[PDB]
């Protein structure tokens, strides 16, 4: 039933390394059986029930079973389970390629479109056919078999390379060693740190270590070495992968009839073509140039003063290892924001509480934590999501907030169960997992403001994953265009820059006292600080991502150095290879990194024109946003759903206004 919880979360995290391996094989046998059954049907015998519905039903059964196998590589504390989960993921990816490239299926899906009365079948059923046929042409099923078999070889290679690329970065354990004097101006961070022989400390290259050093450490030489180590992670092994991966992407795109990989991938996005991306990025890059110059000039003066005051040598430039440091000093001077003070007001429990209350109230939902929930780690917690008005049970979400050995290093959201229809006719309960890495509680976990913003960001995907209700699994949850998928996440970040919202999220960890109104005004005002260089940095990464996928006789590190010089104005350091660490290139954002900035235009347009106009906690606007932007999922195009919400096509006005500008 759609109003209950019992037995709707099919997932289990008990699985041994042997259980995964055998379930992988069992799942392939079960799933292939359906594809064989549809393939054996004669061309005349094909109908909605025996072809379209058969494939749609096995997609639900497959994707659910698959997450029990492919998800434990990111969260299981057992290393042998992670290896089996990874190997299952490689195998099932090779299985996906085989099933996607079935010529007999494609032949029967095409025939079902021409003959069937498309008006008498639902809009989302027409969409399933339109996309299945489109994917068939994108897999080259119209081409000759010898060309298909070549495309198949390269796609199985490309899959393993992509998985290897990001696993190398996850498995990395590189560390440098420094003394107390060398880690100067870092807070008593130093105590939560491992000692070696010679009274020296171990610094990992993980985000909780790297960024505090680059932001706070006042010895230039240790920032320099940390930055060198960070931008050479997996340099040899991941340069080798990129040198294979990018030409293969080009060669496959050429065989499918596209000039480049970027053209191939842009067709499935709301931006449509690479010409619109290039114009979007170049136009925005031009508007930020004056801010970038102004901010580069203040940082450089500030460096000359600090080099004078401390008596260091002054090289007359901003190095990559100076940028985050003097951007932090810029915030402290111009907005009086000490991040290590301010985090005392954001204990993890008060932020979690505030976050969950905000979006219960806004989206008209009710959350309840489940006691003695079945989880993959003791510290992970489960919640059930209800509609409040009807009491309909929409979904569940796991929260996995604290770091450990073997866990995924960065912030992410995973769809575990789709919110789709079953053969039964009932709604499947949506399930999601929020995976982030904040410190853990003898002092409680204190979140920096960007950690709260990351928390809010990722919970936008959780809400998108759960509120989405579609007929078919492939359109469910967050399965939207990649340059649209960051709309729901980036819009919720706006609630972390509002004064009243921030007061609800904050409380001092000892006193219980609120953040002073003065400092609360300055925090909201500091949204604009360093915005030129932060946005120019994102433009560089977007431009590089495009450039690497538009011609593959460029050196990737050179191309990165080029845009760092021309756009950002801060040079990449000789010997580094930032692209070799650029895990978005292998994690389904290939030729699609512009998507962040592209969707931010839409998120800001929605926030200013509708939420900020009629009050940001208004349940009627929040229900509209839920119904028109979250609920449809991938069952509608991104720009149609924007049109339904905004009552018009979007524009940059609000987004431009968010940065300053005009």
């Amino acid at each position: 039933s759609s109003y209950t919880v019992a037995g709707r979360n099919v997932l289990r995290w008990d699985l041994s390394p042997e259980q995964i391996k055998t379930r992988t094989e069992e799942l392939i046998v079960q799933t292939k059986q359906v594809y064989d059954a549809v393939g054996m049907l004669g061309i005349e015998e094909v109908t909605y029930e025996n072809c379209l519905q058969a494939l749609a039903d096995v997609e639900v059964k497959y994707i659910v079973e698959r997450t029990m196998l492919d998800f434990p590589q990111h969260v299981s504390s057992d290393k042998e389970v992670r290896a089996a989960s990874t190997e299952a993921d490689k195998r099932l990816s090779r299985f996906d390629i085989e099933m996607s490239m079935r010529g007999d299926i494609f032949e029967r899906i095409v025939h079902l479109q021409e003959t069937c009365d498309l008006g008498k079948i639902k809009p989302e059923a027409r969409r399933y056919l339109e996309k299945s046929i489109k994917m068939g042409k994108r897999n080259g099923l119209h081409l000759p078999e010898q060309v298909q078999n070549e495309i198949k070889s390269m796609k199985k290679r490309m899959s393993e390379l992509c998985i290897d690329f990001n696993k190398n970065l996850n498995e990395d354990d590189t560390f440098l060693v420094f003394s107390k004097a060398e880690l100067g101006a870092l807070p008593d961070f130093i105590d939560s740190l491992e000692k070696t022989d010679d009274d020296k400390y171990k610094i990992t290259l993980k985000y909780p270590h790297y960024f505090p050093v680059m932001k706070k450490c006042c010895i230039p030489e240790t920032r320099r070495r940390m930055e060198m180590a960070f931008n050479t992670r997996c340099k040899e092994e991941n340069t080798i992968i990129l040198q294979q991966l990018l030409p293969l992407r080009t060669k496959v795109a050429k065989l499918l009839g596209y000039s480049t990989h970027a053209d191939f991938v842009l067709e499935m996005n709301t931006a449509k073509s690479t010409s619109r991306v290039t114009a979007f990025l170049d136009d925005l890059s031009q508007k930020l140039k004056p801010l970038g110059e102004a901010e580069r000039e203040f940082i450089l003066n500030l460096k000359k003063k600090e080099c004078k005051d401390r008596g260091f040598e002054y090289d007359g430039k901003i190095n990559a290892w100076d940028l985050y440091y003097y951007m932090t000093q810029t915030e402290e001077l111009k907005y009086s924001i000490d991040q290590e003070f301010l985090k005392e007001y954001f204990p993890i429990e008060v932020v979690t509480e505030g976050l969950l209350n905000t979006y219960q109230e806004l989206l008209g939902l009710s959350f309840e934590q489940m006691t003695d929930a079945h989880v993959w780690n003791k510290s992970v917690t489960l919640y059930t999501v209800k509609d409040k008005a009807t009491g309909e049970v929409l979904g569940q979400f796991y929260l996995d907030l604290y770091p450990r050995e073997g866990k995924y290093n960065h912030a992410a959201c995973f769809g575990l169960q789709p919110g789709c229809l079953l053969p039964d006719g009932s709604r499947m309960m949506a399930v999601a997992a929020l995976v982030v890495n904040f410190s853990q509680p003898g002092r409680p976990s204190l979140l920096r403001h960007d950690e709260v913003r990351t928390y809010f960001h990722q919970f936008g995907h959780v809400m998108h994953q759960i509120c989405a209700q579609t007929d078919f699994a492939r359109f469910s949850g967050t399965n939207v265009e990649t340059d649209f998928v960051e709309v729901p996440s980036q819009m919720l970040e706006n609630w972390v820059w509002d004064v009243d919202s921030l007061r609800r999220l904050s409380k001092h960890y000892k006193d219980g006292s609120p953040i002073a109104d003065d400092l609360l005004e300055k925090l909201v005002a500091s949204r604009l600080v360093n915005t030129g260089l932060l946005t120019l940095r994102q433009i560089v990464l977007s431009k590089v991502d495009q450039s690497l996928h538009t011609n593959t006789s460029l050196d990737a590190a050179s191309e990165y150095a080029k845009y760092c010089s021309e756009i950002l104005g801060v040079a990449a350091t000789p010997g580094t290879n930032m692209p070799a660490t650029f895990g978005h290139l292998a994690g389904g954002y290939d030729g699609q990194y512009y998507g962040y900035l592209w969707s931010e235009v839409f998120s800001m347009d929605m926030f200013y024109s509708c939420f900020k106009k009629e009050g940001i906690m208004n349940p009627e606007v929040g229900m509209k946003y839920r119904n028109l932007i979250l609920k449809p999922g991938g069952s509608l195009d991104g720009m149609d759903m924007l049109h339904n919400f905004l009552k018009r096509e979007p524009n940059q006005k609000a987004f431009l206004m968010s940065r300053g500008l005009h």
């Binding site: 959201c413 995973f414 389904g588």
Partner: peptide
């Protein structure tokens, strides 16, 4: 797959 995954959403960061």
């Amino acid at each position: 797959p995954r959403r960061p």
